[PDB]
Amino acid sequence: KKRKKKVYTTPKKIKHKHKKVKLAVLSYYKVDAEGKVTKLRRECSNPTCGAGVFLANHKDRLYCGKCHSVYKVNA
Amino acid sequence: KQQLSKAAKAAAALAGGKKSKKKWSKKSMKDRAQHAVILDQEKYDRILKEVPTYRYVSVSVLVDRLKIGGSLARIALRHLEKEGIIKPISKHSKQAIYTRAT
RNA sequence: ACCCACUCGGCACCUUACGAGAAAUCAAAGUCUUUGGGUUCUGGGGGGAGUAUGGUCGCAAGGCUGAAACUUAAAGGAAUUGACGGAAGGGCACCACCAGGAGUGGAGCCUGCGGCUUAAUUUGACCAACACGGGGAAACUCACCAGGUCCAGACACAAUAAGGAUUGACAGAUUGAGAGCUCUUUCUUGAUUUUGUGGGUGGUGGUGCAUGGCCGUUCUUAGUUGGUGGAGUGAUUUGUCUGCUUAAUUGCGAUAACGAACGAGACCUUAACCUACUAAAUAGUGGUGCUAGCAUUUGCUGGUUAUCCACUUCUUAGAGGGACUAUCGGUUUCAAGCCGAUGGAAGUUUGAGGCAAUAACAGGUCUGUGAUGCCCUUAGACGUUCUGGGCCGCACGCGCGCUACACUGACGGAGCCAGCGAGUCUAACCUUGGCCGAGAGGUCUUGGUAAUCUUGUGAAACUCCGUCGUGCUGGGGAUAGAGCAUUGUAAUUAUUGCUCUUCAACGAGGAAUUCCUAGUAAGCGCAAGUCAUCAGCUUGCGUUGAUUACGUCCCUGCCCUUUGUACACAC
RNA sequence: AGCGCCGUGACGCAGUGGAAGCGCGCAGGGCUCAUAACCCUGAUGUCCUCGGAUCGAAACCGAGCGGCGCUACCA
RNA sequence: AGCGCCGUGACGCAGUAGGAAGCGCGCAGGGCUCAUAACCCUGAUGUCCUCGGAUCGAAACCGAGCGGCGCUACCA
RNA sequence: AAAAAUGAUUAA
Ligand SMILES: [K+]
Ligand SMILES: [K+]
Ligand SMILES: [K+]
Ligand SMILES: [K+]
Ligand SMILES: [Mg+2]
Ligand SMILES: [Mg+2]
Ligand SMILES: [Mg+2]
Ligand SMILES: [Mg+2]
Ligand SMILES: [Mg+2]
Ligand SMILES: [Mg+2]
Ligand SMILES: [Mg+2]
Ligand SMILES: [Mg+2]
Ligand SMILES: [Mg+2]
Numbered sequence: 001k002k003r004k005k006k007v008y009t010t011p012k013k014i015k016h017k018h019k020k021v022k023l024a025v026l027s028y029y030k031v032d033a034e035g036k037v038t039k040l041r042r043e044c045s046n047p048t049c050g051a052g053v054f055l056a057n058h059k060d061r062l063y064c065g066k067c068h069s070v071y072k073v074n075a
Numbered sequence: 076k077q078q079l080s081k082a083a084k085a086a087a088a089l090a091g092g093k094k095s096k097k098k099w100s101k102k103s104m105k106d107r108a109q110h111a112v113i114l115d116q117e118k119y120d121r122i123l124k125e126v127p128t129y130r131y132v133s134v135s136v137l138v139d140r141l142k143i144g145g146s147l148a149r150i151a152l153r154h155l156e157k158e159g160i161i162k163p164i165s166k167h168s169k170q171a172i173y174t175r176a177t
Numbered sequence: 178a179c180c181c182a183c184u185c186g187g188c189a190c191c192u193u194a195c196g197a198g199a200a201a202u203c204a205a206a207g208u209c210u211u212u213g214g215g216u217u218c219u220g221g222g223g224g225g226a227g228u229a230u231g232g233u234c235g236c237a238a239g240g241c242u243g244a245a246a247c248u249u250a251a252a253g254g255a256a257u258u259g260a261c262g263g264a265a266g267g268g269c270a271c272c273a274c275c276a277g278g279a280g281u282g283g284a285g286c287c288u289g290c291g292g293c294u295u296a297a298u299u300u301g302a303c304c305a306a307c308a309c310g311g312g313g314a315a316a317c318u319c320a321c322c323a324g325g326u327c328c329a330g331a332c333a334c335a336a337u338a339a340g341g342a343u344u345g346a347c348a349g350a351u352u353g354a355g356a357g358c359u360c361u362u363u364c365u366u367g368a369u370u371u372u373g374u375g376g377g378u379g380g381u382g383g384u385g386c387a388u389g390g391c392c393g394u395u396c397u398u399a400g401u402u403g404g405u406g407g408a409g410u411g412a413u414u415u416g417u418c419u420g421c422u423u424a425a426u427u428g429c430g431a432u433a434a435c436g437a438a439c440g441a442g443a444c445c446u447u448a449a450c451c452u453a454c455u456a457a458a459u460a461g462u463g464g465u466g467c468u469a470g471c472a473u474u475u476g477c478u479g480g481u482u483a484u485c486c487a488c489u490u491c492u493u494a495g496a497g498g499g500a501c502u503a504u505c506g507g508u509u510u511c512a513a514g515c516c517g518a519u520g521g522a523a524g525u526u527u528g529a530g531g532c533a534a535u536a537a538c539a540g541g542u543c544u545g546u547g548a549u550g551c552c553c554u555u556a557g558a559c560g561u562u563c564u565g566g567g568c569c570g571c572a573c574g575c576g577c578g579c580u581a582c583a584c585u586g587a588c589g590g591a592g593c594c595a596g597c598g599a600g601u602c603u604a605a606c607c608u609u610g611g612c613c614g615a616g617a618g619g620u621c622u623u624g625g626u627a628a629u630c631u632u633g634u635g636a637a638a639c640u641c642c643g644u645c646g647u648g649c650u651g652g653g654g655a656u657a658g659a660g661c662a663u664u665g666u667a668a669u670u671a672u673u674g675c676u677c678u679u680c681a682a683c684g685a686g687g688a689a690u691u692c693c694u695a696g697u698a699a700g701c702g703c704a705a706g707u708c709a710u711c712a713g714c715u716u717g718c719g720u721u722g723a724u725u726a727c728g729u730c731c732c733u734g735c736c737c738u739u740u741g742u743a744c745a746c747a748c
Numbered sequence: 749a750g751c752g753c754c755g756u757g758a759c760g761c762a763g764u765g766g767a768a769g770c771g772c773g774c775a776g777g778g779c780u781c782a783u784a785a786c787c788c789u790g791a792u793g794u795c796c797u798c799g800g801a802u803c804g805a806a807a808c809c810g811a812g813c814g815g816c817g818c819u820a821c822c823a
Numbered sequence: 824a825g826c827g828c829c830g831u832g833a834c835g836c837a838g839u840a841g842g843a844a845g846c847g848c849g850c851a852g853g854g855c856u857c858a859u860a861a862c863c864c865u866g867a868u869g870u871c872c873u874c875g876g877a878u879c880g881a882a883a884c885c886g887a888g889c890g891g892c893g894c895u896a897c898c899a
Numbered sequence: 900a901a902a903a904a905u906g907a908u909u910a911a
Contacts, residue, residue, distance in 0.1 A: 001382075003559070010557090015393055016358085017371095019363090021340090041364095056363045056365095061347085062364095064347075065364030069225085
């Protein structure tokens, strides 16, 4: 059984790589002059989400990251 | 073996498609044979007259000697057996055997 | 003229070679490496070639004499084994024929193959391929085509590596898609990994002409081998055989062979026979012993191992018995044996199987195998999964088959009969029965882990009684239209079932060709295998049950022996 | 220069104004392991073109094309 | 010398009365085969000898050249 | 005493 070569009619698509940002201590916690701190991130309602869940921010929605939940800011 | 060319294969396929049906037999047909299934007066008189002196009486001989269908043969035969001018010998479906009375 | 004994010469024979020879063979072809009686002629691998040229003879035909160039690794002799023979002899087979039966080849359809077509229409196989791969493929299967994912890239080295090495992601483009596959902004885990170099793991990739194992075939026949001895320089041969006999290299026997082995036989399973043992509400029968329902001077059924008891005939399985061609009549190298009859259940090894030698095929299978060498491939994979399609595609050719051409029938009503099976608790299998539905089916329970229930698989062919009436007819049921259901996520390219409608070729089939000898052919169905659904297939089972022949070598082949061969890749 | 003839199936050739035939060749099936032979069956033509007469031409008429021929003597 | 002709892949042959080329060999690659040969499939190969003209358009028509074919070539 | 032709190359 002689076989041909698999010629491709489409461009190769790239496997995704995790984006490299050196901002992982900057945009999560803030320090007051006295030193008092309250996290600006919100908390997942489900108990199995974690206290340091750090709900993300989008243009129009909030993303969990662990529990994959969606909320709104003007609730 | 020897592969035929594409033109030869097409010619053979086209010849086979164009080919007529070669029936390998002599087809002989007999002519139309009709039997009066409806019993009119003249045929009934012929029945009542010549059915006696018949040595052998059956659906087939009634059909052959009289142009009546098998259905009329069966019903008329049973009618004659009711009138008793024929007596039975062997009683069976699909085959009747009858002769003269007394 | 015969006989006997001799003798010389001659044509030759038979036995054995002591001798010779490569052997076949040879009383010379002996007296030869232990080489010498005398003498003439001829040859020096095979071809070119008894040719060219010259000479000579001949009327001619031609004869005699007679090279070279060139070309080539064998040509040749005798014998051995096999193979073959339109060679002989003897046996044998229904994959041969005779006498026949049933067919097939013609028709429609089913299925497999080829070819066309195709994006692919995946592929192997050409007596001993073609309902074969257990191959009846909607997904899978799948190996093919159009695309989309994932790594299931172990391990070693090194580089990255404090938000990294890496993932997963809801929403909006996007893709057939609710695959974050790619992106659009930013969240989760955290040395589990990413990258590259070695390596390894997979592959229904290739090669069965690299191989194993298995299977088929040679080959359904009776054939096969060594120990010692004999023959031969040897390859080899005898044993292992002329005759008779058997299915048989089966025996009787003959015998430079003797004793042995495998195969055949013997052996094992299975259908038969057992009024004999063992027994059995999971097989039965009987006592009607208990009540009774019906008819009536006595039969048929219902409840019977707690509503009891007896017995194994029917049934089953344990141990056995039984047939050994027994007896008899014939026939024989009177031996192996064979032909009749009588008994017996059984007298073609009683029937049918299972197993089945040495040697081989470049037979088939790498697509059964975590059987496998080597080659190839390995991240945009020939890996593995997901969606869709294909494997089914049709001017055509072929091989298995199914249904038919009808009255020995079709249709309708009724009578009413098998054997082999199989079947759920890791979950829906075989289904009684009740109800609804024309049907296919649907619903509610029941029994069966099974001699208990489906199931007495109440099958069909069959038989009776009626309709048809020789008309391609009411035979046939192809094609096609419409609807109702079941399986399955998914039914269109129609899974299948059911109802109504359409109602084609087909009038017994040219040349040709297949299977078969008694419970066989053939007809008829049933079960099982594949199965969620799907039989026109296979493997079995029983039902009804012929004709013809107990033979021959004519055809096609097989075995043994003899023979010929310029064959051995073997006619 | 003048005159005559021929053109038909792949090939060689018949052919009566009512649509064309022999032999091979070819094709299908069979037999054979296979090919041939053999057996059983099929198919193949604006009759060189283009017009005309005829109801209808392969044939008759007119041209055009391509081949084959014949005469070519007295000087 | 005249009069007719002809020239088409590497090799032969088909055009036709102008709308761009077919076939057969050869070559190459596939299918079959242990591998070949034969066979089959596919592809490539012709600037129609060169030049010029007429034409919307020429391998087809016209002219020249080149090459080959055929016929003709005082006179008594 | 009917007829019966053929079978490409190489590969212990
Ligand atoms: K046969
Ligand atoms: K055989
Ligand atoms: K039949
Ligand atoms: K798939
Ligand atoms: Mg010599
Ligand atoms: Mg598939
Ligand atoms: Mg093999
Ligand atoms: Mg021997
Ligand atoms: Mg198939
Ligand atoms: Mg009808
Ligand atoms: Mg099958
Ligand atoms: Mg020969
Ligand atoms: Mg040969």
